[PDB]
Design a binder for this molecule. Sequence first.
Ligand SMILES: Cc1cc2nc3c(=O)[nH]c(=O)nc-3n(C[C@H](O)[C@H](O)[C@H](O)COP(=O)(O)OP(=O)(O)OC[C@H]3O[C@@H](n4cnc5c(N)ncnc54)[C@H](O)[C@@H]3O)c2cc1C
Ligand SMILES: Cc1cc2nc3c(=O)[nH]c(=O)nc-3n(C[C@H](O)[C@H](O)[C@H](O)COP(=O)(O)OP(=O)(O)OC[C@H]3O[C@@H](n4cnc5c(N)ncnc54)[C@H](O)[C@@H]3O)c2cc1C
Ligand SMILES: Cc1cc(=O)n(C)c2ccccc12
Ligand SMILES: Cc1cc(=O)n(C)c2ccccc12
Ligand SMILES: [Zn+2]
Ligand SMILES: [Zn+2]
Lengths: 230, 230
Amino acid sequence: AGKKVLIVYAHQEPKSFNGSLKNVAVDELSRQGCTVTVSDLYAMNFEPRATDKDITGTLSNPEVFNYGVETHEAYKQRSLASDITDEQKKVREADLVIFQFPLYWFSVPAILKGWMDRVLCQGFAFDIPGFYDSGLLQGKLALLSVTTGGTAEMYTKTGVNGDSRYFLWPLQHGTLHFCGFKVLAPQISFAPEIASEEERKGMVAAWSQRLQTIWKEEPIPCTAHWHFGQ
Amino acid sequence: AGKKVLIVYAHQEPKSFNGSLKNVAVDELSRQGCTVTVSDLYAMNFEPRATDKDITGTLSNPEVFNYGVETHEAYKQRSLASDITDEQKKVREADLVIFQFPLYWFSVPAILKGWMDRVLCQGFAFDIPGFYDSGLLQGKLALLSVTTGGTAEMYTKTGVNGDSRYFLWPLQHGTLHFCGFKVLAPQISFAPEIASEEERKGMVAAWSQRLQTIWKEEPIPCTAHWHFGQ
Ligand SMILES: Cc1cc2nc3c(=O)[nH]c(=O)nc-3n(C[C@H](O)[C@H](O)[C@H](O)COP(=O)(O)OP(=O)(O)OC[C@H]3O[C@@H](n4cnc5c(N)ncnc54)[C@H](O)[C@@H]3O)c2cc1C
Ligand SMILES: Cc1cc2nc3c(=O)[nH]c(=O)nc-3n(C[C@H](O)[C@H](O)[C@H](O)COP(=O)(O)OP(=O)(O)OC[C@H]3O[C@@H](n4cnc5c(N)ncnc54)[C@H](O)[C@@H]3O)c2cc1C
Ligand SMILES: Cc1cc(=O)n(C)c2ccccc12
Ligand SMILES: Cc1cc(=O)n(C)c2ccccc12
Ligand SMILES: [Zn+2]
Ligand SMILES: [Zn+2]
C-alpha cells in the first residue's frame, strides 16, 4: 500500500502527554511501514503571524496590502516565504494529516492557528471556486487529536462546556472540509492532568490501538447535523 | 463617561475596511468622552506563541514545562513578560473590550489568538472558582466586530458555512464568557471586499451608529441555545 502521514504537532514540552500521543503515533505508523513526517511547530519556532514578510516579490497592490490577494498571487508566482512552501510540500505529499495539540480556548494554540492561516493559502488548499467537496486537498484525510483540561462530562450537551463536537466546527468544517479533506473522527483525550497514571497510559494505548486500523476508517459526515444535532 | 474601552485590533493594513471600522470606533467613543486604548497587534509585532519566554526569571519547574501552570504561578508572583502584563493592565482597566478582526478559518487571526492565549491567563482571567460566572472579568463587556470573505447568505443554517453563530461559540462562550465577560451581540460586517463603495459606507456607519448607543445594550445570553438552538 504505502501511505504518507504528516503530524502537525503543537506542544512546547517533549515529556508532555501531547508529546506521548505524538510519539506513539510516530511509533505505530512507523511500525506499519508508513512514511511519517512531524512538523514540531514550537521546535521550529514556526512564525504564526500573517504578514507582508510572507511574500518576497513585487506586490499586486503595494498601496493597500490584502493578505489573501497577495498570498494567492505569491503562491501562483512562487514567491511565498520558504517556511510556507516547506509545509505545503509536506501536505501535498501526505495521505493523512494528524494535528496533535492541547485545546486552547476551544481551539488550536496560536502557533498552530498560524500554520493554518499561512500554509493553507488560496491556490494551494482551496480556490474560489474550488472549496468544501471541491477543495484542492480532496482525496486527503485529516484527523484532530486534541487533549483538554475539561473532563468528558464537562463536554456534554448539558455540562458547562457544551458538547465537544460544538467546538470542532471551525476546525473540521470551516478549515479542513473547506480545503477538501475528508475528516476522520476526532481523537479527544480528556483531562489527562486530572487522570491517574493508569488512565493516562490507557488513553495513550487507546490512540495507539486506534491507529492500528486507521486506514480502514471512513470519514465523518462533516455537516452541521453531525456537529450540532437536530 | 466615565467608561474605558480597549480595542484589540488585528489587521495588517491601516487603509483596510477593518482599519476603517477601528478608526470609527475610536472617533465615536472618543467623541462620547470615553477613555480609549487600541492594541494594534500587527504594529506591535505582538508575540502569538505560548512559550517559556512568557515567564521572566526562574521557571517554577524547569524539568517539565507546563504552560498553564507556569503562567498561573508567574501571574501570582508578578513574573510574566512585560508584553503580557501591559495588555493585562489595559484589560483590567477597561469596561468594554472590542475585538476588531477579519475572520480567518472561522476564527481570529493567529496574532489575536496569541493575545487570547497569552493575556487571558489563569489567575488573571479565570480560576477555580470563576471560570464562566466567576468570569474574573465579570462586570466587563466584550464585543466581537468581525469582517468576512463569505456573504450573509453563506452564513445561514442551511448555507455552505452554517449560521454565523456556529463559529462564534469558541470565541464568545469558550473564551469571553468563560473569563466572565458579558457578551454584546457581535457586529458582523459580511463580505466588504466585493460590496459597493456605498454598501461599505453603510456598514461603517451602522457600526458608528450602533456605537452611539452601545452603553444601553444588555448582553446576549451566552448559552448553547443562543448559538445553536431555535
Ligand atoms: C492558554 C490555555 C488555554 C486553554 N484552554 C482550554 C480550553 O479551552 N478547554 C480545555 O478543556 N482546556 C484548556 N486548556 C488546558 C489544556 O487543554 C490542557 O492543559 C492540556 O490539554 C493538557 O495536555 P498536556 O500534554 O499539556 O498534559 P501534561 O501535563 O503533559 O500531561 C498530563 C499528565 O500525563 C502525563 N504523561 C505524559 N506522558 C505519559 C505517558 N506516556 N503515559 C502516562 N502518563 C503520561 C504527564 O507527565 C502529566 O503528568 C488551556 C490551557 C492553556 C494554557
Ligand atoms: C487566512 C485567511 C483565512 C480566511 N478565512 C475566512 C473564513 O473562515 N471565512 C470567511 O468568510 N472569510 C475568510 N477569509 C477572508 C477574510 O475574512 C476577508 O478577506 C477579510 O475579512 C476582508 O476584510 P478586510 O478589512 O481585510 O477588507 P478590505 O479588502 O481591506 O476592504 C474592502 C475594500 O474597502 C476599502 N475601504 C477601506 N476603508 C473603507 C471605508 N471607510 N469605507 C468604504 N470602503 C473602505 C478597502 O480599501 C477595500 O478596497 C480568510 C482570509 C484569509 C487571508
Ligand atoms: C474554556 C475552558 C474549559 C475548561 O474546561 N478548562 C479546563 C479550561 C482551562 C483553561 C482555559 C479555558 C478552559
Ligand atoms: C471557510 C471560508 C468560508 C468562506 O465563505 N470564505 C469566503 C473563505 C475564504 C478564505 C478561507 C476560508 C473561507
Ligand atoms: Zn464539514
Ligand atoms: Zn456562554
